[PDB]
Scaffold this active site. Structure first.
Site, PDB file in Angstrom:
ATOM      1  N   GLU A 123      -4.774 -10.307   0.050  1.00 14.21           N
ATOM      2  CA  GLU A 123      -5.515 -10.304   1.287  1.00 14.21           C
ATOM      3  C   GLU A 123      -6.936 -10.477   0.921  1.00 14.21           C
ATOM      4  O   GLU A 123      -7.418  -9.813   0.002  1.00 14.21           O
ATOM      5  CB  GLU A 123      -5.426  -9.042   2.130  1.00 14.21           C
ATOM      6  CG  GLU A 123      -3.991  -8.584   2.305  1.00 14.21           C
ATOM      7  CD  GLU A 123      -3.922  -7.229   2.922  1.00 14.21           C
ATOM      8  OE1 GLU A 123      -4.847  -6.737   3.552  1.00 14.21           O
ATOM      9  OE2 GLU A 123      -2.750  -6.658   2.721  1.00 14.21           O
TER      10      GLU A 123
ATOM     11  N   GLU B 151       0.762  -1.202   0.000  1.00 12.00           N
ATOM     12  CA  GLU B 151       0.000   0.000   0.000  1.00 12.00           C
ATOM     13  C   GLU B 151       0.817   1.288   0.000  1.00 12.00           C
ATOM     14  O   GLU B 151       0.890   2.079   0.946  1.00 12.00           O
ATOM     15  CB  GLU B 151      -1.267  -0.108   0.905  1.00 12.00           C
ATOM     16  CG  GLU B 151      -0.957  -0.589   2.304  1.00 12.00           C
ATOM     17  CD  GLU B 151      -2.179  -1.079   2.998  1.00 12.00           C
ATOM     18  OE1 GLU B 151      -3.227  -1.264   2.422  1.00 12.00           O
ATOM     19  OE2 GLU B 151      -2.005  -1.259   4.296  1.00 12.00           O
TER      20      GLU B 151
END
EC number: 3.2.1.23
Lengths: 410, 107, 205
Positions: C128, C52
């Site tokens: 994820e 991220e």
């Protein structure tokens, strides 16, 4: 059935005449400009005073015209065609044809002498449109279609397989009224007028060769046999030579349910060579063979797989992402409309809407193939398989339409 | 509904001469316009169907033309047997409707 | 999957540093040293550029570096949309099975759909998925089923293993599980640190 079921005519042509002609339209990046290209061939004696004029009208208004004498460009070591000529007309900001708006032009082909004398003339309607598969998507004039279509047979409860203008028109209007864009000529070339109406009212048409060997074992048996190559060949080539100039035709199909043979591969290549303006499709042999530009299965479910040996039918959403696959998927037949049916129709519509590469399909089918019979008191009734003492037969299997044979809706 | 207007209402002609009869629809009807001939004490007779399609058994001198809203029935070299009434009829939309008719008389 | 120590989640936009040549060096060392150190282990089968940190030119360079240096393994990075030019695998986080979440710039298509987007051909493995926070894991099976039906859906990484709770003691030397903000910590994300499948003591949820 059998007989002389389409028309019979007499045509009188000059001795020196137009033997064939084709039209083609190229566009620029944004379609603001097009080129109309006409190739003309003639038969008879070639005399230097011969000319050809191709004129494009839009209504009453002539939009473009071109004149020339016979004799093409050098093609190979021996030269060119002396009996052909190709003209190219430039058209600025052409009105485009689509099923949404069937913009049409008229093209006139005159074969005359130089002193202005007309030997003879031919014509056709012209629609400016580009059809392409690009990057997994099927595009029409640059945007991606979503085919809302149906398969339609040439059937009349009274006339059997003889078609008439009234019937054609009825069908067309019902379809358009009911939200259809396109039709598939299951499973042979149709009566000529059909294309013309589609051209005019606005329906996309998939033109299909008259070839179905469903009953062989295996299915391939003839289509894989070089000895049938010629026969097959004529069923494809003639179709193309005849229907190639209609704008409504956007896809060519090699036939139906005849498995997958080397004969298909050849014929598919032939078409691509001859008329690269349209894509070719064929479902036989698994729906995704080397003979089709589009994955075009019949009865593939949305979410569930049906993995028959050799020729499974994956769930449509899954089929697209199979490794290496990149073609668009459009069902040649889906949602079998036999009797009290159409359950789940919406599931399909929803996938179509969520997955880009799922560009719709052809429902099966338009009209019930029921026929009219009469009772003890001259009272009519709808007959089906085996009702004519017909053997062997498939009974109701001939009734899968969305409308009854009389054109009244289910 | 579709209204068909025929003109002229009456036409006088001398045998041998040609004439053309008009039929106009209130809205487009494509090519679904047919022509009928009707004589006193007789049922209508179909002459032309779908604007210009010929009918077996009808004299060749009868021809039809047009599309959309304007149609014409032409008679090349009128014969005495041609005198009577002529009606156009559309079948593009239900209810099918007839024009008011044109009377062809000897002049 | 060995991952570089690089996360700039809190910048605006996410890219801000990773798109800046001035951070190229710093980033560079976080990738290169990892590789020089772990490259000989057989268990490592995929390299990841971080997490991220949006998608910047720095990633593209670093991804190319790896490919050059150690072509034995694939590289993956989810930032910037999960399917950038910096990843060998489509590796989104929290993409649903059947429903799309089309955020601007960085939508999350339904996994089954993502694969057949025009031109796409890479395998898809979720970095994820199935956020295991507290009473969770509903729908887990939906995932398993797609994985099983679609070849190019080669699974994923559940988020996550252990609860990041910490031990605190009461008025009587009695321990208790503490979380965000329980240390007078500011600012904080409270329970957000507890998404494990097992409790911090390794007892299963």
């Amino acid at each position: 059935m059998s007989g002389i079921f389409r028309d019979v005519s007499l045509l009188h042509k000059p001795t020196t005449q137009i033997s064939d002609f084709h039209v083609a339209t190229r566009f620029n990046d944004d379609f603001s400009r097009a080129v109309l290209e006409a190739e003309v061939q003639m038969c008879g004696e070639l005399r230097d005073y011969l000319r050809v004029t191709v004129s494009l009208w839009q209504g009453e208004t002539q939009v473009a015209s071109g004149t020339a004498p016979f004799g093409g460009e050098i093609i190979d070591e021996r030269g060119g065609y002396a009996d052909r000529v190709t003209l190219r007309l430039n058209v600025e900001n052409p009105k485009l044809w689509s099923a949404e708006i069937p913009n049409l032009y008229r093209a006139v082909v005159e074969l005359h002498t130089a002193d202005g004398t007309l030997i003879e003339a031919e014509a056709c309607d012209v629609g400016f449109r580009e059809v392409r598969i690009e990057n997994g998507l099927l595009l029409l004039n640059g945007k991606p279609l979503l085919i809302r279509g149906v398969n339609r047979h040439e059937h009349h409860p009274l006339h059997g397989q003889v078609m008439d203008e009234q019937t054609m028109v009825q069908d067309i209007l019902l379809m358009k009224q009911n939200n259809f864009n396109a039709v598939r000529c299951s499973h042979y070339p149709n009566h000529p007028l059909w294309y013309t109406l589609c051209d005019r009212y606005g329906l996309y048409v998939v033109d299909e060769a008259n070839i179905e060997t469903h009953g062989m074992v295996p299915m391939n048996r003839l289509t894989d046999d070089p000895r049938w190559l010629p026969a097959m060949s004529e069923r494809v080539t003639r179709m193309v030579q005849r229907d190639r100039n209609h704008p409504s035709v956007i896809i060519w199909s090699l036939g139906n349910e005849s498995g997958h043979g080397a004969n298909h591969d050849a014929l598919y290549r032939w078409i691509k060579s001859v008329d690269p303006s349209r894509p070719v499709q064929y479902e036989g042999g698994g729906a995704d063979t080397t003979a089709t530009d589009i994955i075009c299965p019949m009865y593939a479910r949305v979410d569930e797989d049906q993995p028959f040996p050799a020729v499974p039918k994956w769930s449509i959403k899954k089929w697209l992402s199979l490794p290496g696959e990149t073609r668009p998927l459009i069902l040649c037949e889906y949602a079998h409309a036999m009797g009290n049916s159409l359950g789940g129709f919406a599931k399909y519509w929803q996938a179509f809407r969520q997955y880009p590469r799922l560009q719709g399909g052809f429902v099966w089918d338009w009209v019930d193939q029921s026929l009219i019979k009469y009772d003890e008191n001259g009272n009519p009734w709808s007959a089906y398989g085996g009702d004519f003492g017909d053997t062997p037969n498939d009974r109701q299997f001939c009734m899968n339409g969305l409308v009854f044979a009389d054109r009244t809706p289910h | 509904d579709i209204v068909l207007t025929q003109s002229p209402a009456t036409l006088s002609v001398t045998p041998g001469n040609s004439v053309s009869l008009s039929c106009r629809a209130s809205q487009s009807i494509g090519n679904d316009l047919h022509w009928y001939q009707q004589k006193s004490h007789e049922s209508p007779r179909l002459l032309i169907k779908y604007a210009s399609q010929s009918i077996s058994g009808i004299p060749s001198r009868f021809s039809g033309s047009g599309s959309g809203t304007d149609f014409t029935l032409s008679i090349n070299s009128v014969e005495t047997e041609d005198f009577g009434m002529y009606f156009c009829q559309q079948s593009n939309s239900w209810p099918y409707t007839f024009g008011g008719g044109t009377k062809l008389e000897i002049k």
